[PDB]
Paper text:
Nonribosomal peptide synthetases (NRPSs) are multimodular enzymes that catalyze the biosynthesis of diverse peptides with a wide variety of activities. The incorporation of an acyl into peptidyl backbone is usually implemented by a starter condensation (Cs) domain, normally located at the beginning of the initial NRPS module, via the formation of an amide bond to the α-amino group of the first amino acid residue, a process also known as lipoinitiation. Genome mining of two Cs domain-embedded cryptic NRPS biosynthetic gene clusters, rzmA and holA, in the bacterium P. rhizoxinica HKI 454 resulted in the discovery of two distinct types of lipopeptides, cyclic rhizomide A (1) containing an uncommon acetyl chain (C2) and linear holrhizin A (2) harboring a medium octanoyl (C8) chain. Similar to other C domain structures reported previously, RzmA-Cs adopts a “V-shaped” configuration and consists of two subdomains (N- and C-lobes) each representing the chloramphenicol acetyltransferase (CAT) fold.
After our initial attempts to cocrystallize WT RzmA-Cs with acyl-CoAs of various lengths failed, we noticed that the R148A mutant protein showed strong binding to C8-CoA, as evidenced by the high ΔTm in protein thermal shift assays and a Kd value of ~300 nM measured using isothermal titration calorimetry (ITC). The unbound R148A structure is mostly identical to that of WT RzmA-Cs in two conformations. The CoA portion binds at the “donor” site of Cs with its loading arm inserting into the active-site tunnel formed by two lobes, while the acyl chain turns nearly 90° and extends into the N-lobe as the R148A mutation opens up a pocket between the α5 helix (where the R148 residue is located) and the β sheet. In addition, this structure helps us understand the conservation of G145 (within the “HHxxxDG” motif), because at this position in the C domain (starting point of the α5 helix), the residue has to sacrifice its side-chain to make room for proper binding and positioning of the donor substrates. Four residues, Q36 on the β1 strand, Q136 and Y138 on the β6 strand, and M143 on the loop between β6 and α5, were selected for this purpose. On the basis of the complex structure of the Cs domain with acyl-CoA and of both in vitro and in vivo mutation experiments in this investigation, we revealed the binding pocket of acyl group and the key amino acid residues that control the length of the acyl group.
Numbering used by the authors: -1 to 430
């Protein structure tokens, strides 16, 4: 079959991270849990023709957006292809409730599983929800985009659209090619760097135990996350974290403390999503992120400062080795097939939420952030702002909306009490 020879000749292997997504997606091919999505609210007038010109330009510039996947006897393969696509424009301003109609439209798209060999793998759409209020909806499959990549694209699209609105030529894009991302990952897989990283992680999680969880059960995730959202003032942590790093340290320390106070587990392993973007990888939209195991030991009557100490140590030791995939680590330690290294992940996203489109201000709002195996604490923070957005994303098989809400309210309060006195022992604090 010359047809099969040609597909193998004209394609590239998936990266390790892409492969892990592909395998998980194959387990539940009808589950939409690997869709990621957000919308950008623009407080102004958008011209859809110019917006679509900007999207065409960024689809040329971010070639991950033109990735095509083709199955082979040696697994899924990819190439820079020729996806057909369109930008729907919906004026919902005459609806009884335009905001709800916009949410319903976006949800109708992101609830649908993407077929990886047919696409479309992304969706871009414009939804007018009030006079001078527009929403730009962005949806991706996780195999070809992660959070930082989506952030890079939204920034570029805002920039290009603003230049085209002004009638000037957009300055040259600084994105690299997804091909160089793939080649660098291919070299990592056979690298001595990876052998070192693996050694560190095997030594680090030498032996384990069932992860502390807030649910009555552990189950695979098949449905879209249950989400509870709270907006919090960053005054409520003091100056504990004027820093993305220290914010991640505080969020992990607090979540570990909550898990201990609620479950009695003293060895709490959390998942810490990381970007895995050094050097040139910082400018290549596509799928790159990893999730590290982060171990926090709850000593007798220890305080918040101690826990944050411990978390900072874990981060400063393990972040250098962040390229080693956590599922590779799982397999290599020889764990039971279905059992995780962590159930609760702490996803801190210090990405600027603000944009400007044609002199009009805009803000980003997450809709989907990946699968919620158990519980994921998503934290959105524009560096410098005094405001955080905190999501509890949970597996619907393991949590109820109101149980999750009660946990979030208890945790938010607990968290504010901890940051109100980092020296207080965590056993000594009442919780709702
Ligand atoms: C469409 C909707 C979009 C949203 C969908 C999201 C879907 C997803 O699930 S994808 C995941 C999204 N989440 C993320 O990307 C997580 C981002 N957050 C984080 O990475 C962590 O929380 C955070 C904030 C602690 C990372 O902290 P950060 O300071 O950036 O560390 P990082 O840049 O990774 O590297 C630092 C360490 O790497 C090590 N390192 C190794 N090599 C190098 C190198 N060449 N250069 C620099 N550091 C290196 C060093 O030890 C370094 O430590 P230090 O700077 O102290 O010397």
């Amino acid at each position: 079959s010359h047809m099969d020879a040609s597909v193998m000749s004209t394609t590239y292997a998936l990266s390790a991270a892409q492969t892990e997504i592909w395998l998980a997606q194959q387990l539940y091919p009808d589950s939409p849990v690997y869709n990621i999505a957000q919308y950008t609210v623009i407080e102004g007038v958008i011209e859809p023709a110019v917006f679509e010109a900007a999207l065409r330009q960024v689809i040329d510039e971010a070639d991950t957006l033109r990735l095509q996947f083709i199955d082979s006897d040696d697994g899924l393969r990819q190439r820079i292809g020729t996806p057909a696509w369109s930008m729907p424009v919906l004026d919902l301003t005459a609806q009884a409730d335009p905001q709800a109609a916009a949410q319903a439209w976006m949800r109708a798209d992101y609830q649908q599983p993407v077929n990886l060999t047919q696409g479309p793998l992304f969706c871009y759409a414009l939804l007018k929800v009030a006079p001078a209020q527009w929403m730009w909806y962005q949806r991706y499959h996780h195999i070809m985009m992660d959070g930082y990549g989506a952030y890079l694209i939204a920034q570029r699209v805002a920039y290009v659209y603003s230049a085209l609105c002004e009638g000037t030529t957009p300055a040259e894009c600084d994105f690299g090619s997804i091909l160089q991302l793939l080649e660098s990952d291919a070299q990592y897989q056979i690298s001595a760097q990876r052998a070192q990283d693996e050694a560190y992680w095997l030594k680090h999680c030498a032996n384990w135990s069932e992860p502390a969880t807030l649910a009555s059960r552990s189950a695979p995730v098949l449905q879209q996350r249950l989400r509870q959202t709270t907006y919090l003032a960053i005054q409520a942590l003091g100056d504990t974290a004027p820093d993305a790093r220290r914010l991640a340290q505080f969020m992990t320390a607090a979540m570990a403390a909550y898990l201990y106070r609620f479950t009695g587990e003293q060895d709490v392993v959390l998942g810490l999503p990381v970007k895995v973007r050094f050097g040139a990888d910082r400018h290549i939209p596509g799928m790159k992120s990893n999730t590290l195991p982060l171990r926090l030991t709850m000593r007798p009557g220890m305080n918040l400062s101690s826990l944050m100490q411990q978390a900072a140590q874990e981060m400063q030791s393990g972040l250098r080795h962040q390229r080693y995939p956590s599922e590779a680590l799982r397999r290599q330690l020889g764990m039971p097939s279905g059992q995780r290294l962590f159930g609760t992940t702490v996803n801190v996203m210090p990405f600027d939420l603000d944009l400007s489109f044609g002199g009009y201000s805009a803000t980003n709002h997450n809709l989907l952030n990946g699968p919620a195996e158990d519980l994921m604490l998503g934290v959105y923070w524009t560096p410098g702002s005094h405001q955080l957005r905190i999501d509890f994303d949970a597996n619907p098989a393991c949590y109820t909306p109101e149980g999750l809400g009660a946990h979030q309210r208890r945790f938010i309060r607990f968290m504010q009490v901890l940051a109100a006195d980092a020296t207080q022992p965590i056993d000594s604090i009442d919780l709702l």
